[PDB]
UniProtKB/Swiss-Prot annotation, chain A:
PROSITE patterns: RIBOSOMAL_S4 (PS00632), S4 (PS50889)
SUPFAM superfamilies the UniProt entry points to: Alpha-L RNA-binding motif
Consequence of changing residue 50 to D: In rpsD101; suppresses a temperature-sensitive mutant of release factor 1, R137P. Not a ram mutation
The protein's assembly and partners: Part of the 30S ribosomal subunit. Contacts protein S5. With proteins S3 and S5 encircles the mRNA as it enters the ribosome, which may play a role in mRNA helicase processivity. Some nascent polypeptide chains are able to cross-link to this protein in situ. The rRNA transcription and antitermination complex (rrnTAC) consists of RNAP, NusA, NusB, NusE (rpsJ), NusG, SubB, ribosomal protein S4, DNA and precursor rRNA; S4 is more flexible than other subunits.
Pfam families the UniProt entry points to: Ribosomal_S4 (PF00163), S4 (PF01479)
Domain (S4 RNA-binding) ranges: 95-155
Protein name as annotated: Small ribosomal subunit protein uS4
Alphabetical GO biological process terms: cytoplasmic translation; DNA-templated transcription termination; maintenance of translational fidelity; negative regulation of translational initiation; response to antibiotic; ribosomal small subunit assembly; ribosomal small subunit biogenesis; transcription antitermination
Biological classification of the source: Bacteria, Pseudomonadati, Pseudomonadota, Gammaproteobacteria, Enterobacterales
Entry keywords, A to Z: Antibiotic resistance, Repressor, Ribonucleoprotein, Ribosomal protein, Ribosome biogenesis, RNA-binding, rRNA-binding, Transcription, Transcription antitermination, Transcription regulation, Transcription termination, Translation regulation
Organism: Escherichia coli (strain K12)
Swiss-Prot record, chain B:
Domain of life: Bacteria
Gene3D superfamilies: Ribosomal protein S20
Upper classification of the organism: Bacteria, Pseudomonadati, Pseudomonadota, Gammaproteobacteria, Enterobacterales
Annotated coiled-coil segments of the chain: none
Oligomer status and interactors: Part of the 30S ribosomal subunit.
Its biological purpose: Binds directly to 16S ribosomal RNA.
The name this protein goes by in its record: Small ribosomal subunit protein bS20
Transmembrane segments: none
Start and end residues of each stretch annotated as Disordered: 1-24
UniProtKB/Swiss-Prot annotation, chain C:
Induction of expression: Part of the rpsP-rimM-trmD-rplS operon.
GO molecular function annotation: DNA endonuclease activity; four-way junction DNA binding; structural constituent of ribosome
Protein name, as recorded: Small ribosomal subunit protein bS16
SUPFAM superfamilies, per the entry: Ribosomal protein S16
Gene of this entry: rpsP
Organism whose genome encodes this protein: Escherichia coli (strain K12)
Length: 205, 85, 80
RNA sequence: UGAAGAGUUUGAUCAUGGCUCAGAUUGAACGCUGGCGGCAGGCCUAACACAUGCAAGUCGAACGGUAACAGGAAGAAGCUUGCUUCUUUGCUGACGAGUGGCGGACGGGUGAGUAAUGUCUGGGAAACUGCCUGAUGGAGGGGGAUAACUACUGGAAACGGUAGCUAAUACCGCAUAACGUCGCAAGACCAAAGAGGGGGACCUUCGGGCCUCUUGCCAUCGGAUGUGCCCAGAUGGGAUUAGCUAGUAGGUGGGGUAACGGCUCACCUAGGCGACGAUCCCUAGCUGGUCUGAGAGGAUGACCAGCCACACUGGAACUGAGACACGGUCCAGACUCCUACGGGAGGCAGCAGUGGGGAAUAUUGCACAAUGGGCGCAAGCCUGAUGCAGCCAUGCCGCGUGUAUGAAGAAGGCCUUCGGGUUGUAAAGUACUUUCAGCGGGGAGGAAGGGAGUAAAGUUAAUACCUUUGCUCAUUGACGUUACCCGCAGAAGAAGCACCGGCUAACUCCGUGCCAGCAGCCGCGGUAAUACGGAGGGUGCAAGCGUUAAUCGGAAUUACUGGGCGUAAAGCGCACGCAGGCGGUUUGUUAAGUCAGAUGUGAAAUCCCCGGGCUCAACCUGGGAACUGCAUCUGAUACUGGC
């Protein structure tokens, strides 16, 4: 599965930044957010309650690029040990290797981080990885292989990571290009705009 | 093929030619005491049992009745002769 | 009639090899009377891959059960 | 200490309800579109069907034997003078056929039968019980047969029939006589097979008597593991199924069996069962469990665990601990298959390919190497068991089809009271970089022993074997692009499918014009149709996408949890009344039920939590926690039953 439209089309339909098609421009340019809103939303719809709901569900999915069958599985795993689906769901998305390889700055987007794993450019605990849909735990070590360290897209992704807030869940060193996971993330320490009010009530009425 | 039915289902006839001739000979001596329990005087049935037992237990050491049947032929028959004097 | 034998386990291509006391009747892997060890082929590259209860085995073969010559050769691997 | 709702009767409003839908189940098809892996599975459909090839062997340490191999032995040659060669000989290692024993009632397959001693579960009495393992006695001597091999015959023939020879641990007498037979008891009665090794006195061409060892034989009785029987509980439809037995209902004596029983022959009687649902037809094997849900309940059993039944279809006996015995015996019939046209042989519901059915389901592959089981006191063999190779958009899972940068935003299309917008950072180009494919380079572990040398009271006759241990010889792989990991030039071969008024989001402009074709429902459609078709776009999913029979949830819409009966759906027109069911208050007492306590059970899996190991995860595995249940033996008697 892929998205074959312009990646900023999503952010331009949302009127909000989704961290898509990122590189050495970092933010806002030429994202045209609320400057090129397109053919819908200007003029933001009222519509059904089934809007937020679906268009709010897509906004918590597409920001991690996650497919519906994955998202339902993370809703199952977030419904474990009374941890709350409004909270412990974030740990299953933010703790995923295609977000970790992005947070470490090896990719400029979660797509570009996922690509680097599908191109076998990444290691986890000294072994090569090809699966990007995988959970990372404390004391797990993630690094880029010498055969891929010189790709211009990684060069740009590390310069963009310096323009991004540092995570309190994992560490990374720019000289070894190696980072280690430290603690699983928390709502009031992630401190950003992501939903709660819908991820507390999915797949039920 | 080339299986044991030859010495089994087909040569059990050579055993029939021996077991059956013992079983009838034996059953005659049983019937010669199972009639004698109508008395008078226990000695007739006692003598006929003492003529039965030697030819019954002759089939009870190998083959025909060598496992359970030989005493089965005597058990309740004793309880049919001890009712006399 | 009862043998101290191997049970493959692990279905297709991923054997686990347990050593069990079992009748010549019924099952070929499960349905066993008593387990007496294991012969695990993928043991984390450690010597923890072989276990044998030599006391219970001696009582099973003493009392009249068959011990396999394959297992008799493996008694040497647990020392001894 | 536990949980999806909305739409819709009308001129409309409020209740209530039929229906449609959410998410699974999947042991699938369609039919477009199809870049590749990883794991699993492979006829729920006619007990319908087939060519050819397979699927059950094995022991000479039970035995008469000796074609073949090599030794030993006795001779003969080359002279090679220490071996090679030849003949002769079962002495020995051994072995082709046969006699004999063990196994082939297993591992499997299928689901026709069956609403049932068939299944699931706990007990019992009159019981056996090959295999495994024990004790206490016995352990001498004869004989009749029959295959191999031959004679002949129906032969077209696999052959197997009619006759002959001969041997045994096969088959039958004699000798011996309790732990046993039956009982409280005297007492009568009968079997066996030895076999293979090892060795000391004295001597030999070893031609050892005799003792000792291992492992067998007979009886009698135990241990164990199983099994036949008897008891008590779960186990379709139909009550417009009302009749059902009759070895039935209750007794008696033998015979049969390990043993209950009308098992089985006789003889002694005439009942027995049922509306509180007997009984018979239709359909159907059952269960660990799986699927669904918050659960109850409902559905369902392939695949992974466990029984039964069944072997062309029907039927009969033997063998045995167990079978009307898939690859055995004996018959009948059908249909294939063959024919020398005189009659002959076959069992796909073991495994392969396949005929046929159905919407529909893997190759006439390689190998006995590993491992289970089978023989043999064992090396060694058998195996369509098993272990491997090959197949799939059938499922479950996973990945790819390139990234950067590139305008008030081109040329074109599509929308636009012509301002602009939109396809679209997309492209054109400009800078870089490759997953899988392909082609190459490295490479685990699966495999371990037996024969022997050696050597100990373990055993014995304290220098074999056997028992046992180290080293040293001997020395086993069908599978190999094995598992796993790394590279090479190159964007290299790679995206489709459904949907767009209301519910339920995405649509503007046209085409058609009540026509043509959609759905879950109203319906959409007559010249400005969001639903049909087309253009340009949008929305969702993606090597798929849509679509559905079949099972649950939602369905409190059968209410056990959990409902209603004045009128929506319902008190059945009204009085009496047996069984059934119900029953005030209190002192005793029974202790079935209940709860308590204890001893057993709820297997392996699996749901849940946390590990290990194979791309993630599944899975396969390791430990916890569960499986709120069930069987019994004691206690208490509040309360239901009982006195």
């Amino acid at each position: 599965a892929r998205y074959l439209g312009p990646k900023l089309k999503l952010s331009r339909r949302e009127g909000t930044d989704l961290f898509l098609k990122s590189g050495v421009r970092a933010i806002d340019t030429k994202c045209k957010i609320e400057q090129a809103p397109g053919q819908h939303g200007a003029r933001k719809p009222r519509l059904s309650d089934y809007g937020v709901q679906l268009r709010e569900k897509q906004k918590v999915r597409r920001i991690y690029g996650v497919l519906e069958r994955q998202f339902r599985n993370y809703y199952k795993e977030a419904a474990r040990l009374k941890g709350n689906t409004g909270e412990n769901l974030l740990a299953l998305l933010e703790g995923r290797l295609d977000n970790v390889v992005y947070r470490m700055g090896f990719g400029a987007t979660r797509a570009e981080a996922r690509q680097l794993v599908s191109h076998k450019a990444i290691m986890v605990n000294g072994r090569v990885v090809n699966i990007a849909s995988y959970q990372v735990s404390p004391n797990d070590v993630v690094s880029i292989r010498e055969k891929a360290k010189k790709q211009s897209r990684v060069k740009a992704a590390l310069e963009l990571a310096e323009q991004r807030e540092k995570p309190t869940w994992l560490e990374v060193d720019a000289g070894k290009m190696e980072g280690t996971f430290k603690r699983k993330p928390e709502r009031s320490d992630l401190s950003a705009d992501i939903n709660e009010h819908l991820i507390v009530e999915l797949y039920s009425k | 093929n080339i299986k044991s039915a030859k010495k089994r289902a087909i040569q059990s006839e050579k055993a029939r030619k021996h077991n059956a001739s013992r079983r009838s000979m034996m059953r005659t001596f049983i019937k010669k005491v199972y009639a004698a329990i109508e008395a008078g005087d226990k000695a007739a049935a006692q003598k006929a049992f003492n003529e039965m037992q030697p030819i019954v237990d002759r089939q009870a050491a190998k083959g025909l009745i060598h496992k359970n049947k030989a005493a089965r032929h005597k058990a309740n028959l004793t309880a049919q002769i001890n009712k006399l004097a | 009639m009862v043998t101290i034998r191997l049970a493959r386990h692990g279905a297709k291509k991923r054997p686990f090899y347990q050593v069990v006391v079992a009748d010549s009747r019924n099952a070929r892997n499960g349905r066993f009377i008593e387990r007496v060890g294991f012969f695990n082929p993928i043991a984390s590259e450690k010597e923890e891959g072989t276990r044998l209860d030599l006391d219970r085995i001696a009582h099973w073969v003493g009392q009249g059960a068959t011990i396999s010559d394959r297992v008799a050769a493996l008694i040497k691997e647990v020392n001894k």
